[PDB]
Design a binder for this molecule. Structure first.
Ligand SMILES: O=C(Nc1ccn([C@H]2C[C@@H](F)[C@H](O)[C@@H](CO)O2)c(=O)n1)c1ccccc1
Ligand SMILES: O=C(Nc1ccn([C@H]2C[C@@H](F)[C@H](O)[C@@H](CO)O2)c(=O)n1)c1ccccc1
Lengths: 809, 809
């Protein structure tokens, strides 16, 4: 139907149809008379999966023969979403499967909606890992993603009476056709026990054993016949476990609880024992697998054949675990072992918020991992000896840099452990990486400046354009060809079309079609009625105070109050959509969701407003929903307080898909504006330096309330019960926080934000000039492909060359 | 290679080879370079499974079109063993797969050993259910087996220092290629809650819900293209379950514990709540499935289209559950509902031992199943009104017949509930069925004589001859053809060969080959050295006092003592093998295992004995081990105290496979001896009437000890520490039980048993006359095919005609 979706040859279509029918009969054990749409989805998934296996076996055989340097990406989160369409895209099978299913009397898009998301992450950090796997395969790198196969991923969010409710995400209920269990490569992991010292070194004894069983999922590169592996570990009790009789069998559950559920708290550290067990479990099983594979090729060459990338500090125990194995089991001396470890490991930081840093109580490590605690103390002593030699007499530096934090409870700072034991430390956007060198890791940067790098985040143009926005991918390919899909810098060629009346019309037409599709989806699956001619104003991301969904709320109420003040005045109509999940224990985030729905309840039912303003809370935001709403957006809200969002990646998805951005100079927004030109971006608010000035002086929210009459009115409406008539004091916590305890200075950016929003509305009144600015954004989005990002990791950290060359089919 | 194993045609062999290679590549995702024998087993299992699915789909479609009366066999145990060879046998694929695998460079028998047993039962009752499924499919009946998919079946038994140790039977670890999950047919099951009375009847409210997810396994008939279904339910928590957050997800395990593990106690009732939940879970989900299927065809015709067979009282809650559904949900009046229930249900009793009867505490039923308790009280009241009208003034009869037992704790007698609510009640051998009418159910037989039947047990000649003893099946088919495999009465034709010198030699040759094979197996997999020329004397069955493994022990010690007394005298050499699992909490049974190994330790290492006597404990006895040892046996020990073993089925397996029987006149032994002729059986000991005489008088074990010098010596050896030098008093519990508290009168049968054993040894000295008696046994074993048994259930209980006609291929 459309060219970017590949060929639908007679031979291929014929073959797909017969393999579909074979799977329905032999694999699903059904006939057409009893088959449900879910059966049809599974028959299709099994048919596409068959096309992967040949390439998967030959890719792994090739790595064994050629023995390249292997890249191991360790993460506690992989936010993968759905797999069927992504696989078809990367294999050039989409049009053929479309034709084949059409001829069988089926609608492929309907079958695609049956697949569950693999929701094994919370947000940006987990989705980054997923984009990275796609780019590593597309660039022909010998890479493996290693994680945990959670039985329950991120909860499903229901909204009841305006409140978030959590439901278990039982994503494996119907089975997962993409994974292959490998019970034959099961490995033991040890917990508790104690340390014995012999003549021949330390011994970790009397441990409890949990088994780690791997499940492998294929990761196809874009049309290069490369298929890499994501290996996820599942916890199993050993068979002599606890072995009155009935209870001993039932208690096997205790061991298997390790892989049961993803912790849903992002940007807030809780020192729970089960989380620590999860972190060690992934690290210990992964490291045995790495060493196994290396021996099947003397540890001097270890860093030449192995790179380990730590996705934040979550897998930081890799550092002392690798030391444990090299020293205790392989009997290398300390200094040699340490050299190998440092050259092998590298660490990526994703936040500067203090409450998000992992600082584990020593008493936990003492009981659970007694040998690792001893290794950490020894690392600390030797590291601080170096600091002392470089900065003699600087006793406070020693306290600041220690891996051991003194106090009420002693803790281990995992970020300090990661810097000490890695040859490279990177932030995730230029501004973030600079803040690391100047503030939180300043001491470490002074000691070892060579370690610190930047690697600005990116997104995969496969999932985030071709898959989710085929209409836009097509009008682009018509002018410039198909090469941009794996070389996104080619989008620059589109600047020579900014005055092309045909292109302008095509860009605007694709956006309108996207909005109609999404406007209909809202009514079908959620029974809500929106005007598709309105400006689609969207903020989708996890709910946190720093992301300032509340500032968005203040603008919405301002617009409503202005309308009620002058009802017969013209305003540009808007549909304001906000979505995202809150962490189950985060009270303020749950209150913000309730406020948004409460505003909707008032605004959406005021007859004087008409269809000039609508406020929609988008329920259960997740990867598959993102693929729908992002192509439909006109305005992307990226309004975190300057200095708080390390990079952002949602921002990049919106830029690629033809939305304009309103945002602060924070995270990757700075580089986006630099690429597109500041004239083509809606920048507002305090810069980082302005925030610091305000902190030195002292932030007084009262000053703003006193001097801005429009802001005062809103606060009075909130306090008095305007948005909660039956429960007048419902929002008192929100008002109190805003007035007296606001870490993120919502009031301070209010005036400039409202002013900037007026400028957005002004441009939207001129469709032709709106679209020309859109083209300037899409055309300059090339830097933000994760192919660029991964190529920089490869060259500057891992020491390997990317390859765009195909393997034989 | 051998004719009974079918054809190996060029076309078939070619096809099997290519489908094997396809499964290895696409299903297992391996090449030949990395494949292990387990991979090869799975590729073969998937290849054979493909041949079932066509017939499975068309069998079930046929039942929908023709709408026959459906038979539902409810059991908490299905002791299935391995599936691969059984499937090949029933599909006539064995020789072809043998050829195909040979040509691929593989040994099929080696791959067969990789499959795990489906150990979802304890012993005779569970294995009977498995033989029954095979016979129902072979006789073309529209039958479904319904049970629980336990994650852990009967424990694996290890012997450590002579003691039994239990290990979890993690049989699903590598996957089960035979089952198909059907998450689409998931059904809710309710627990706890309370009863409300409305104007329109009772309502069961405020319940906790557990989901029941079915898994279907194919059951192929013997070469008739019929494939029936065994549907096993798995427990799942609902997704809003318990829905701080982390714990609520982890607590889902509580619900899912219902299907976690098989209770390993046979013949001893424990009133554990988890067991009650298991019993209701299977009944509630099964009954919804039955009704669903019936509606897709007015409840008057219900008994015309449905039969429910209760395998003991374990699924007895079907009776009040069916009443609950018909009265509370369908709104039938009580009397009509009861008529339907009685005509639908039938009950099979498997034991007379008082401690095995299910008598559930009323307080358990009150809390867990409040509505069912009310229904049971109402059933009881109406039943006792009938007893009172038939036997006016007989107040003690009313107490004896009540479903409610009075006392310390009130209990419900589930056996009484089953008789009241079933149109048929049967025992499992003629002697057992007579004991039911004369003793434990005498009152019920007087009230409703028409309800009571006999159905003597049987075994399937597919698993228990063709599969496990192909050598014997072949020499038989050479003379009389292949028809006997589904018409076992044809074995009578073999009587005309009792004087045939060629046949005599062939029968003896097959036995010797079986013994050599098993003698080698013992050395390979268990490093133990036996003489294959010795008489193989075997007792394999679950360990219980009533089965009298201890009497066997007394004989063994007698033989050892006689040898030591006159070392240079000739005796017929024996290998005495005893095997079977003990229930984890049964102390005496665990002591008996230790005694057997302790005797072995002394006997097997006495240089004066030589290889004239060996005592072997066969570890981890289970279905796959039975298939090995039974064809190797010369002597079958069936020596329960008269009146205690309801039928036995192991006895029948040994008779079919060319062992002679030493046994009491108990259970089916009586009918076996009647079929073969008493001259061709080694019968000894008290009859039932002799046991009763002894009970009236009072059993005094001292009298035997005082009057039998050989018995006194053994007891003195046991007490003094002869068999436990380092632990002289180890066996004091055993001696005390024998001397003062022996319910099963071991001493009373001792003299006659030893005498009878001398007669066995005498016949074994004359190989030709031994074999002629063997032929007379095999020739008269036809009555004990489960095809005969199932045909009687069909005609006399279920009201359906068996059919040997094929479905189209
Ligand atoms: O800080 C935690 N979890 C985080 C931290 C940062 N991030 C984001 C921030 C965003 F700027 C960036 O674009 C994205 C990819 O780099 O990472 C995120 O998604 N989860 C955390 C995790 C577990 C426990 C406690 C805190
Ligand atoms: O009595 C119980 N469990 C039994 C009872 C009898 N049986 C056997 C006895 C045997 F004679 C017969 O051949 C075979 C088939 O009919 O059944 C058996 O294998 N389990 C029981 C079960 C659960 C809890 C408590 C007791």
């Amino acid at each position: 139907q459309i060219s970017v979706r590949g060929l639908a040859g007679v031979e291929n279509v014929t073959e797909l149809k017969k393999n579909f029918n074979r799977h329905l009969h032999f694999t699903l054990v059904k006939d057409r008379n009893v088959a449900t749409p879910r059966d049809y989805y599974f028959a299709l998934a099994h048919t596409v999966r068959d096309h992967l296996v040949g390439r998967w076996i030959r890719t792994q055989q090739h790595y064994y023969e050629k023995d390249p340097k292997r890249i191991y990406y360790l993460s506690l989160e992989f936010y993968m979403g759905r797999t069927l369409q992504n696989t078809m895209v990367n294999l050039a099978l989409e049009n053929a499967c479309d034709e084949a299913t059409y001829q069988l009397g089926l609608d492929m898009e309907e079958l695609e909606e049956i697949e569950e998301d693999a929701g094994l992450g919370n947000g940006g950090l987990g989705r980054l890992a997923a984009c990275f796997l796609d780019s590593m395969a597309t660039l022909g790198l010998a890479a493996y993603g290693y994680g945990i196969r959670y039985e329950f991923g991120i909860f499903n969010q229901k909204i009841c009476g305006g409140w978030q409710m959590e439901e278990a995400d039982d994503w494996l209920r119907y089975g997962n056709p993409w994974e292959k269990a490998r019970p034959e490569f099961t490995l033991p992991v040890h917990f508790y026990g104690r340390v014995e010292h012999t003549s021949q070194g330390a011994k970790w004894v009397d441990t409890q054993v949990v088994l780690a069983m791997p499940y492998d999922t294929p990761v196809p590169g874009y049309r290069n016949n490369v298929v890499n592996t994501m290996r996820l570990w599942s916890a199993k009790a050993p068979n002599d476990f606890n072995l009155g009789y009935i209870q001993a069998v039932l208690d096997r559950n205790l061991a298997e609880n390790i892989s049961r559920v993803l912790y849903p708290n992002d940007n807030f550290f809780e020192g729970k024992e089960l989380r620590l067990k999860q972190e060690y479990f992934v690290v210990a099983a992964t490291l045995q697998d790495i060493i196994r594979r290396f021996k099947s090729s003397n540890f001097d060459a270890f860093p030449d054949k192995v790179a380990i990338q730590l996705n934040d500090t979550h897998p930081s125990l890799a550092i002392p675990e690798l030391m444990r194995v090299l020293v205790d089991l392989e009997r290398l001396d300390w200094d040699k072992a340490w050299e190998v470890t440092v050259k092998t490991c590298a660490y990526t930081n994703h936040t500067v918020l203090p409450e998000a840093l992992e600082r584990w109580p020593v008493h936990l490590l003492e009981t659970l991992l007694p040998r690792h605690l001893q290794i950490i103390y020894e690392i600390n002593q030797r590291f601080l000896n170096r600091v002392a030699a470089a900065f003699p007499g600087d006793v406070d530096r020693l306290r600041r840099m220690s891996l051991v934090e003194e106090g009420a409870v002693k803790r281990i700072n995992m970020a300090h452990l990661c810097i000490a034991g890695s040859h490279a430390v990177n932030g995730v956007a230029r501004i973030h990486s600079e803040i690391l060198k100047k503030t939180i890791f300043k001491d470490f940067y002074e000691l070892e400046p060579h370690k610190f790098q930047n690697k600005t985040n990116g997104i995969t143009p496969r999932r985030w354009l071709v898959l989710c926005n085929p209409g836009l991918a097509e009008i682009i390919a018509e002018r410039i060809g198909e090469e941009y899909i794996s070389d996104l810098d080619q989008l620059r060629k589109l600047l020579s079309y900014v005055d092309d009346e045909a292109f302008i019309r095509d860009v605007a037409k694709v956006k309108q079609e996207n909005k109609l599709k999404f406007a209909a989806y809202l009514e079908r699956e959620y029974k809500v009625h929106i005007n598709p001619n309105s400006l689609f104003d969207v903020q989708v991301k996890r709910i946190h105070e720093y992301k300032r969904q509340l500032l968005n709320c203040l603008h919405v109420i301002t617009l409503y109050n202005r309308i009620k003040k002058e009802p017969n005045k013209f305003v540009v109509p808007r549909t304001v959509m906000i979505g995202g999940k809150a962490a189950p224990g985060y009270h303020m985030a749950k209150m913000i969701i309730k406020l948004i729905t409460a505003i909707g309840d008032v605004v959406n039912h005021d007859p004087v407003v008409g269809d000039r303003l609508r406020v929609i809370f988008l329920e259960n935001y997740r990867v598959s929903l993102a693929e729908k709403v992002i192509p439909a957006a006109d305005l992307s809200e990226q309004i975190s307080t300057a200095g708080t969002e390390a990079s952002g990646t949602g921002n990049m998805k919106f830029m690629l898909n033809g939305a304009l951005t309103i945002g602060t100079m924070d995270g990757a927004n700075v580089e986006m504006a630099e690429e597109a030109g500041e004239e083509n971006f809606f920048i507002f608010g305090m810069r980082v330096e302005d925030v610091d000035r305000l902190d030195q002086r002292g932030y007084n929210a009262q000053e703003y309330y006193d001097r801005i009459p429009e802001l005062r009115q809103i606060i009075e409406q909130l306090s008095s019960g305007f948005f909660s008539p039956k429960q007048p004091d419902l929002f008192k916590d929100i008002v109190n926080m805003l007035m007296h305890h606001d870490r993120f200075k919502v009031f301070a950016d209010y005036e400039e934000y409202v002013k900037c929003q007026e400028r957005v509305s002004a441009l939207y009144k001129n469709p032709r000039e709106w679209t020309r600015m859109v083209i300037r954004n899409i055309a300059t989005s090339g830097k933000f492909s994760s192919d660029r990002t991964i190529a920089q990791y490869a060259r500057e950290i891992w020491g390997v060359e990317p390859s765009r060359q195909r393997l034989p089919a």
